[PDB]
CSV table of C-alpha atoms and ligand atoms in Angstrom, one decimal:
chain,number,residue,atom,x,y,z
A,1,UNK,CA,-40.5,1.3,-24.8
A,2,UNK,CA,-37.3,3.4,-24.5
A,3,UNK,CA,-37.8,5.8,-27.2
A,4,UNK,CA,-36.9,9.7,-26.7
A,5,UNK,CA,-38.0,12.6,-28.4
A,6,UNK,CA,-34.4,14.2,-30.4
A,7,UNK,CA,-34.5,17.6,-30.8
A,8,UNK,CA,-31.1,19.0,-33.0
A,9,UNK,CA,-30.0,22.8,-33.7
A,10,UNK,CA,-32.2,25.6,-33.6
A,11,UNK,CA,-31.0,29.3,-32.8
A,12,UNK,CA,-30.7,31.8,-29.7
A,13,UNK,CA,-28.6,34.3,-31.0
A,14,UNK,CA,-26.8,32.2,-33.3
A,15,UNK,CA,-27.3,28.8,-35.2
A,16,UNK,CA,-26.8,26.1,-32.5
A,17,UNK,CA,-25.1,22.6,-32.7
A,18,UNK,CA,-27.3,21.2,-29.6
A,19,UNK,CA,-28.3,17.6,-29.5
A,20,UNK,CA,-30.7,17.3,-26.9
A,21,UNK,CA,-33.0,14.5,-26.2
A,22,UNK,CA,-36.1,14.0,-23.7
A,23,UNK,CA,-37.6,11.3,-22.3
A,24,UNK,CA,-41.3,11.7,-21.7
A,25,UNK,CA,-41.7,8.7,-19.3
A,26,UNK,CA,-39.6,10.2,-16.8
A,27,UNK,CA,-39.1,13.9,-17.5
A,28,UNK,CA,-35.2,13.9,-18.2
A,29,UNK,CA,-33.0,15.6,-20.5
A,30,UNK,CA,-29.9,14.1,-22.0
A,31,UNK,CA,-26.8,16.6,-24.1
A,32,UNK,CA,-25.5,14.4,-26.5
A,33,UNK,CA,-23.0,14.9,-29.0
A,34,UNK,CA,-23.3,18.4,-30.7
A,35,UNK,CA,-24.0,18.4,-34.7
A,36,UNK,CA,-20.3,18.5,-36.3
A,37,UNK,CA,-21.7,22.0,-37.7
A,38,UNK,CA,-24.3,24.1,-36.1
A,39,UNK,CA,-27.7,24.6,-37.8
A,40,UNK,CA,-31.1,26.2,-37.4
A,41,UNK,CA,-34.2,26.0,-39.8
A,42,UNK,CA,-33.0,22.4,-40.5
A,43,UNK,CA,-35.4,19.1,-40.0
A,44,UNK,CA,-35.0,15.7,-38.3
A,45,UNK,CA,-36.3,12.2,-39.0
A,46,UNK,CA,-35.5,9.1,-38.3
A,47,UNK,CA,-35.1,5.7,-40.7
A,48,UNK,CA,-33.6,2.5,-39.1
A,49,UNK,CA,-33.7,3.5,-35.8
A,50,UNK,CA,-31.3,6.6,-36.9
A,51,UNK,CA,-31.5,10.4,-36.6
A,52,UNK,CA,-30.9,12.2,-39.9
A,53,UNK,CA,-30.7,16.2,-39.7
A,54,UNK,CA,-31.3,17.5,-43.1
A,55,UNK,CA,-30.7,21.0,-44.2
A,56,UNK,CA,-30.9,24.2,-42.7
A,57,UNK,CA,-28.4,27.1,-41.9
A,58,UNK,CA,-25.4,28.7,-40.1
A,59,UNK,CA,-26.5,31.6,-38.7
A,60,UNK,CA,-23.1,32.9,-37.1
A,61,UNK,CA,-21.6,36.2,-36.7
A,62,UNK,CA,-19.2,35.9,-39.6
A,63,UNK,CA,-22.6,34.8,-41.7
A,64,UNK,CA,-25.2,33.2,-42.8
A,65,UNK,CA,-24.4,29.4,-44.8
A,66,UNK,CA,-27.2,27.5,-46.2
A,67,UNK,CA,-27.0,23.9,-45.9
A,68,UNK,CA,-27.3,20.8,-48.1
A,69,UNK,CA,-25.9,18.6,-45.6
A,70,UNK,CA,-27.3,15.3,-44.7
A,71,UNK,CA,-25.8,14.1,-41.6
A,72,UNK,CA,-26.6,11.0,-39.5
A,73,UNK,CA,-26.4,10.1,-35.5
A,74,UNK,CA,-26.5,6.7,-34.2
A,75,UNK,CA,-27.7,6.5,-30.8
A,76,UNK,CA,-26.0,2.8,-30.8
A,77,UNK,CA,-22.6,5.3,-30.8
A,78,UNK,CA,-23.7,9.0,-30.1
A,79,UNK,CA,-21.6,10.0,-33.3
A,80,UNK,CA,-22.5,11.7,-36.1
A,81,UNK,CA,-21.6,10.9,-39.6
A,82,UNK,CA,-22.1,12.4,-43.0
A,83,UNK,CA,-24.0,11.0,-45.7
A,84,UNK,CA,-24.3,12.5,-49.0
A,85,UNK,CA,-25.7,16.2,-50.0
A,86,UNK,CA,-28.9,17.3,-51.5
A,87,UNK,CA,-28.3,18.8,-55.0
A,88,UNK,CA,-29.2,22.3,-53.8
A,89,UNK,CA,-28.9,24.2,-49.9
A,90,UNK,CA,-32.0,24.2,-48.3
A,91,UNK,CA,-33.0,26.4,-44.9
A,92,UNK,CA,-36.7,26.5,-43.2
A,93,UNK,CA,-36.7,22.7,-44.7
A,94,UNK,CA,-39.5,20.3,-44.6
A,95,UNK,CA,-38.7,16.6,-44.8
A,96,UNK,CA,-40.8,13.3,-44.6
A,97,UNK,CA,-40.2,9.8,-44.8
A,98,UNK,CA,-41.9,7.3,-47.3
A,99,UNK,CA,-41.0,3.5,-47.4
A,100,UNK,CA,-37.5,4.4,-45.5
A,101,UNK,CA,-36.9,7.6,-47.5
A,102,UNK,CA,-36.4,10.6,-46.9
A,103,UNK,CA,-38.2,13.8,-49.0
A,104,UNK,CA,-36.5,16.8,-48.7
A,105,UNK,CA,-39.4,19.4,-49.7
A,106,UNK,CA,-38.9,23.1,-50.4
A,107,UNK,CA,-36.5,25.8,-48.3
A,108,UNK,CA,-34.6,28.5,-49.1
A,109,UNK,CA,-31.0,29.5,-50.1
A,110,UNK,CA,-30.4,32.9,-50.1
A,111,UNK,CA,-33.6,34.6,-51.8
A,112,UNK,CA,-34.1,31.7,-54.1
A,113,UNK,CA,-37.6,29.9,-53.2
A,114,UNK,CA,-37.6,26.3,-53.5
A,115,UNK,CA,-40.5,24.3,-54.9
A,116,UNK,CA,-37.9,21.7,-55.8
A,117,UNK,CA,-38.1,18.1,-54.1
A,118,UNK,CA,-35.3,15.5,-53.7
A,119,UNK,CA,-35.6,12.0,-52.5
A,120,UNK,CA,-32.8,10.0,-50.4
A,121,UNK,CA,-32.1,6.5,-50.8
A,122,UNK,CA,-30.2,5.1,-47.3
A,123,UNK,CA,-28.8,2.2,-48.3
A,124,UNK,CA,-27.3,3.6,-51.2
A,125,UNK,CA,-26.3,6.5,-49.5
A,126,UNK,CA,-27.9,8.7,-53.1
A,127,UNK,CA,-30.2,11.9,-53.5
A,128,UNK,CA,-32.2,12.0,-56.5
A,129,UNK,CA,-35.0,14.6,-57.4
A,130,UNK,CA,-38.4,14.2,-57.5
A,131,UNK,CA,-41.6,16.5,-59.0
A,132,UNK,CA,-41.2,19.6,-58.0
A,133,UNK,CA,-44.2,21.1,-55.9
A,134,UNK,CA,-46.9,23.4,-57.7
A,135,UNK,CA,-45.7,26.8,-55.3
A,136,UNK,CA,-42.6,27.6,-54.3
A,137,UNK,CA,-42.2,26.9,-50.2
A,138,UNK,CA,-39.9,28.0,-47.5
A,139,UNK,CA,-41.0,27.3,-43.9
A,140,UNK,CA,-43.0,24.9,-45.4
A,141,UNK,CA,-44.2,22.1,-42.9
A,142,UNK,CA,-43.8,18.2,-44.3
A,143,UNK,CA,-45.8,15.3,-43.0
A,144,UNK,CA,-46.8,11.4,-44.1
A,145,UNK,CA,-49.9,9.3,-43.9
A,146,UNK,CA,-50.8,6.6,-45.7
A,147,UNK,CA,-47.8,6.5,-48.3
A,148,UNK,CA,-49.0,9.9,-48.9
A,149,UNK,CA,-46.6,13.2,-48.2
A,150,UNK,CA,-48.3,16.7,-47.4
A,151,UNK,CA,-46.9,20.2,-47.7
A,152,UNK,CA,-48.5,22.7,-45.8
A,153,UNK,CA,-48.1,26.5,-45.8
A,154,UNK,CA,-45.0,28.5,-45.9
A,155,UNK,CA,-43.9,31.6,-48.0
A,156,UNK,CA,-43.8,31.4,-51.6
A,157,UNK,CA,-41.5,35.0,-52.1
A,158,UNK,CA,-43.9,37.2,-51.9
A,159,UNK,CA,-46.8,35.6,-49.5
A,160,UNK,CA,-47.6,33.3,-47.0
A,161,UNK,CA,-50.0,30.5,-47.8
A,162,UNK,CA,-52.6,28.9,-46.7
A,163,UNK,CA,-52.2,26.0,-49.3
A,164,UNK,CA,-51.3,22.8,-49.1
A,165,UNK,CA,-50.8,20.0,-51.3
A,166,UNK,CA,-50.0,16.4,-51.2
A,167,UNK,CA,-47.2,13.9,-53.4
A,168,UNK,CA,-48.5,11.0,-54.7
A,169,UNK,CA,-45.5,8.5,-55.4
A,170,UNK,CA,-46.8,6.0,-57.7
A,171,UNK,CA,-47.4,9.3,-59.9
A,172,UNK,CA,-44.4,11.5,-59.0
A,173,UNK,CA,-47.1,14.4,-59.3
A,174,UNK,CA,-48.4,16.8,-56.6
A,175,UNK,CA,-51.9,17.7,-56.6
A,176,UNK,CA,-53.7,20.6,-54.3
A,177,UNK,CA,-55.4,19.5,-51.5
A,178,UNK,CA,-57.9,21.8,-49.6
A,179,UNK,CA,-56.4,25.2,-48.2
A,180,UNK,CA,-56.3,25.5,-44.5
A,181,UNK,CA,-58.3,28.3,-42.5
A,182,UNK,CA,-55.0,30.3,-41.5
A,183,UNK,CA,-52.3,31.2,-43.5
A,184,UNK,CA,-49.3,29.7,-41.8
A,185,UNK,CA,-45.7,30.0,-42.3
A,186,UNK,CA,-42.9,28.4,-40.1
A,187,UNK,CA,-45.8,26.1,-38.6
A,188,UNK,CA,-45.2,22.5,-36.8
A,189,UNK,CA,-46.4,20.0,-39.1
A,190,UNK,CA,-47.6,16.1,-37.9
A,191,UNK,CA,-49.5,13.4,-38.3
A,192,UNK,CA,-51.7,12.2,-35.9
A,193,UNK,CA,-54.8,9.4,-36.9
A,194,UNK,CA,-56.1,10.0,-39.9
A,195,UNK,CA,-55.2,13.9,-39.8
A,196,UNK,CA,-52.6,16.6,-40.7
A,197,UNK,CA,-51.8,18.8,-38.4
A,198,UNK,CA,-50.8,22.5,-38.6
A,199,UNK,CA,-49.8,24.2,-35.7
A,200,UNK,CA,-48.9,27.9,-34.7
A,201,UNK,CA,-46.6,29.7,-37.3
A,202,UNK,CA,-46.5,32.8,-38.5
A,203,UNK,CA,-49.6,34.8,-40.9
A,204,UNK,CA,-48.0,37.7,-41.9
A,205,UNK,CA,-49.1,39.7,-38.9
A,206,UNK,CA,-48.3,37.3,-35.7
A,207,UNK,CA,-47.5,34.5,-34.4
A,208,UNK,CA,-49.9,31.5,-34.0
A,209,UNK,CA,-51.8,29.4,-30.7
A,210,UNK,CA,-54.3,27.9,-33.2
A,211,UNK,CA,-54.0,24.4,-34.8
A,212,UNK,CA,-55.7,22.7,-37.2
A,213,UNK,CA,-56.5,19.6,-38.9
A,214,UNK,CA,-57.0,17.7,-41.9
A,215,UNK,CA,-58.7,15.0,-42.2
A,216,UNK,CA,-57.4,13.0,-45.5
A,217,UNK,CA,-60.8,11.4,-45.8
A,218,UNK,CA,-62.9,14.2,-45.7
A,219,UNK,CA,-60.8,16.8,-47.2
A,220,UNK,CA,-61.6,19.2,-44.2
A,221,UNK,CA,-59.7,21.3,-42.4
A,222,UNK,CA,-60.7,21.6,-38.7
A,223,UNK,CA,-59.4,23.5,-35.6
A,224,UNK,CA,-58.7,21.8,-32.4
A,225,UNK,CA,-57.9,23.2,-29.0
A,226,UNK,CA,-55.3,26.0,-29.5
A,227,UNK,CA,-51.4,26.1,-27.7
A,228,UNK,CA,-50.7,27.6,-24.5
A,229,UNK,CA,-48.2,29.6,-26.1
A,230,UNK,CA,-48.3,31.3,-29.7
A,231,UNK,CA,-45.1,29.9,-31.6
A,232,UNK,CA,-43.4,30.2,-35.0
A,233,UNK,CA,-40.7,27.9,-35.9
A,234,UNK,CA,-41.5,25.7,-33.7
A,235,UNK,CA,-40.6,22.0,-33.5
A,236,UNK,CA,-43.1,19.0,-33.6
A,237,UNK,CA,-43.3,15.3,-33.4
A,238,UNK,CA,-46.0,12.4,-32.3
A,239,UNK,CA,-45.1,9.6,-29.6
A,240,UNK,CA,-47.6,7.4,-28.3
A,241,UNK,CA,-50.7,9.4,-29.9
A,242,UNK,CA,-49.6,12.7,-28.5
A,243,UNK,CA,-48.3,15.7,-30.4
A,244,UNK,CA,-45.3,17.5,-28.9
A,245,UNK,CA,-44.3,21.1,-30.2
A,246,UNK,CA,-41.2,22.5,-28.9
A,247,UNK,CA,-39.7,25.9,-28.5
A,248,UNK,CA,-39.9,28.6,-31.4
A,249,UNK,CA,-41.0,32.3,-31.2
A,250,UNK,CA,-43.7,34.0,-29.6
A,251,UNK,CA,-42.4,37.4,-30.8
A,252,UNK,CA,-41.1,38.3,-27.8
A,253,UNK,CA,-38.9,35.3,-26.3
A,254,UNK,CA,-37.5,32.5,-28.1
A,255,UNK,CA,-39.5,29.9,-25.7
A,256,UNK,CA,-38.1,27.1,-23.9
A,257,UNK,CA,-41.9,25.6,-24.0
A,258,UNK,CA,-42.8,21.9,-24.6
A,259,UNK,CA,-46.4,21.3,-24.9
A,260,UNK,CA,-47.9,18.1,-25.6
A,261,UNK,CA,-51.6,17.6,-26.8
A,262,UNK,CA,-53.9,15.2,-26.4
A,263,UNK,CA,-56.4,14.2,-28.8
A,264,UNK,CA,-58.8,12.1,-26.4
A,265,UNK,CA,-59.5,15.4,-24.5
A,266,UNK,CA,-58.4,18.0,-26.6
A,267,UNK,CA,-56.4,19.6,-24.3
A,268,UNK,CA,-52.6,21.0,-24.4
A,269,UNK,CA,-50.4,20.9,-21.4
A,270,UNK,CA,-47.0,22.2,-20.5
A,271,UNK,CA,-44.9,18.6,-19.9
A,272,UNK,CA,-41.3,20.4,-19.9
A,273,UNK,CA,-39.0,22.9,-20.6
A,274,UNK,CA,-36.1,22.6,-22.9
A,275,UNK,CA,-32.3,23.5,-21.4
A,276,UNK,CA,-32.6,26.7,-23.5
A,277,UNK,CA,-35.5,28.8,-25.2
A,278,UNK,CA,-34.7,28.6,-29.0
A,279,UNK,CA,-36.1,28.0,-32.5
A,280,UNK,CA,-35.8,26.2,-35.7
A,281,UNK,CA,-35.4,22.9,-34.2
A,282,UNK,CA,-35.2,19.7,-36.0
A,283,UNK,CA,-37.4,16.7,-33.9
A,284,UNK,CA,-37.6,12.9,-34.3
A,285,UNK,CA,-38.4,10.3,-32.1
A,286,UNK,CA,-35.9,7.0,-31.9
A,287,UNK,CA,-34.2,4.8,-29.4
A,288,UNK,CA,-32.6,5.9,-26.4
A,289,UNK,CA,-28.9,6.2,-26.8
B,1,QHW,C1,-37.3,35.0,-35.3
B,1,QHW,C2,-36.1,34.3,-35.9
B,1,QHW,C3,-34.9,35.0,-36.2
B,1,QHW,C4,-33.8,34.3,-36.8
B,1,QHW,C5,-32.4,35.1,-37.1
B,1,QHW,C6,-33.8,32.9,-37.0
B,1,QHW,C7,-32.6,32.2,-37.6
B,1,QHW,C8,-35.0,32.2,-36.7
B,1,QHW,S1,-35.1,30.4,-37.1
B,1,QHW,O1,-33.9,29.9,-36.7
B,1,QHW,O2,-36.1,29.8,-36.2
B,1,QHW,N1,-35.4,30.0,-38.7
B,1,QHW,C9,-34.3,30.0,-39.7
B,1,QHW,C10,-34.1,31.3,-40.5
B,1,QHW,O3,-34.9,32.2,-40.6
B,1,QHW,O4,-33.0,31.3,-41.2
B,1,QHW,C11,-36.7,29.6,-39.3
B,1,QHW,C12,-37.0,28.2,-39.2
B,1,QHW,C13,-38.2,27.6,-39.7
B,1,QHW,C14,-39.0,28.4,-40.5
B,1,QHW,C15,-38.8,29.8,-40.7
B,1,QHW,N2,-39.7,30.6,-41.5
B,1,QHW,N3,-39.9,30.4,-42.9
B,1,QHW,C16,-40.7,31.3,-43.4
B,1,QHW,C17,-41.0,32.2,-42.3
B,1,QHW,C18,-41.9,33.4,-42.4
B,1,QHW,O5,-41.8,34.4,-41.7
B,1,QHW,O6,-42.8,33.4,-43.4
B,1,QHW,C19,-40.4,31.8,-41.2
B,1,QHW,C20,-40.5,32.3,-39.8
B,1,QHW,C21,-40.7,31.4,-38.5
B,1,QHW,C22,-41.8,32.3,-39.1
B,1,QHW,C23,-37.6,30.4,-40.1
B,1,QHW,C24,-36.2,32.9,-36.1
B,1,QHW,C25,-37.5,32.1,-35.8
């Protein structure tokens, strides 16, 4: 009990410093303290009960900054706090946590295409790198099962994917797994059972409603009941077997939607709205504050 879904940054206009936070057991929002710099393509995760916001970018006026920043809110304090940089700036990130670290996977930095991969050590407060991936991924999306980390999709410089592939620790090597149906950049990324999920994103042509899933057993990729709303950019997290995908772009509005899915029924319905319609979100799910 008392957990909240976190949802940091994202853009309207402009990169945004937002910390927002909702709790699903009673339909409330709660502002909490604003990142110390705004960011958008960015992602969230949480070790230890606390929120990490990893990467991204200042989209302002005066410019565009790509981030390596690591920084780290304690809902015991509603502060952030720094923690040490990644070795390289990273926007349209993908992160996932193994054993209490974090992977940083992929993103951009001005019209370099990352297939690098870092690691981040909490307790020692260190980055190190890792194998880099086979493809080069921006708007790549990041999840874990099983000790295992998937990256799914994005845009490799010159086209979106459909390909995925999967980090195996023990062997600091990434294999290819089985490409999904769609090519999907900018997707929400989970993990839900025994199954990735990929949903919405962008193919080259449109925005995304489908989602799909693969099942880590069987190496398939299946679709499952598709979004209300197309979305790119969108954010996504689990809590208590349901997927959540926040805001993003429907290439018209930047949404305000929160769907949550069901896997029992396979069914999608609208549970909130955000404050604001925006993208590029980073999610987690911790503690109340
Ligand atoms: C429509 C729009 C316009 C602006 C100015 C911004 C900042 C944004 S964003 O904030 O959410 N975003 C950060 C950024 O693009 O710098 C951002 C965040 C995550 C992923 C990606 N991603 N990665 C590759 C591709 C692709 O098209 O293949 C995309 C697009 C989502 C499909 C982008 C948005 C949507």
């Amino acid at each position: 009990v008392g957990r909240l879904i976190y949802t940091a940054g994202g853009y309207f206009r402009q990169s945004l410093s937002y910390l927002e936070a909702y709790n699903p057991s009673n339909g409330s929002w709660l502002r909490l303290a604003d990142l110390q710099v705004p960011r958008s393509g960015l992602a969230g995760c949480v070790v230890g009960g606390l929120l990490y916001a990893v990467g991204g970018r200042n989209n302002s006026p005066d410019g565009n900054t790509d981030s390596s920043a690591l920084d780290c809110y304690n809902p015991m304090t509603n502060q952030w706090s720094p923690c040490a940089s990644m070795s390289v700036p990273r926007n349209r990130i993908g992160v996932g946590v193994i054993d209490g670290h974090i992977y940083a996977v992929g993103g951009s930095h001005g019209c370099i295409h990352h297939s690098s991969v870092e690691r981040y050590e909490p307790e020692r407060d260190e980055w190190h790198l890792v194998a880099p991936m086979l493809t080069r991924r921006i708007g790549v999306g990041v999840a874990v099962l099983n000790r295992l980390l998937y990256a799914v999709g994005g845009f490799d410089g010159t086209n979106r994917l459909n390909s995925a592939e999967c980090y195996y620790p023990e062997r600091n090597e990434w294999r290819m797994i089985t490409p999904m149906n769609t090519i999907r950049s900018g997707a929400g990324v989970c993990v839900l059972h025994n199954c990735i999920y990929a949903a919405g994103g962008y193919d080259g042509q449109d925005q995304l409603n489908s989602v799909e899933r693969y099942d880590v057993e069987t190496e398939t990729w299946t679709f499952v009941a598709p979004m209300r709303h197309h979305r790119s950019a969108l954010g996504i997290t689990v809590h208590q077997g349901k997927i959540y995908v926040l805001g993003g772009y429907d290439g018209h509005t930047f949404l305000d939607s929160v769907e949550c899915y069901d896997p029992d029924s396979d069914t999608w319905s609208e549970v909130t709205r955000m404050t604001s319609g925006r993208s590029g979100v980073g999610v987690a799910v911790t503690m109340e504050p």
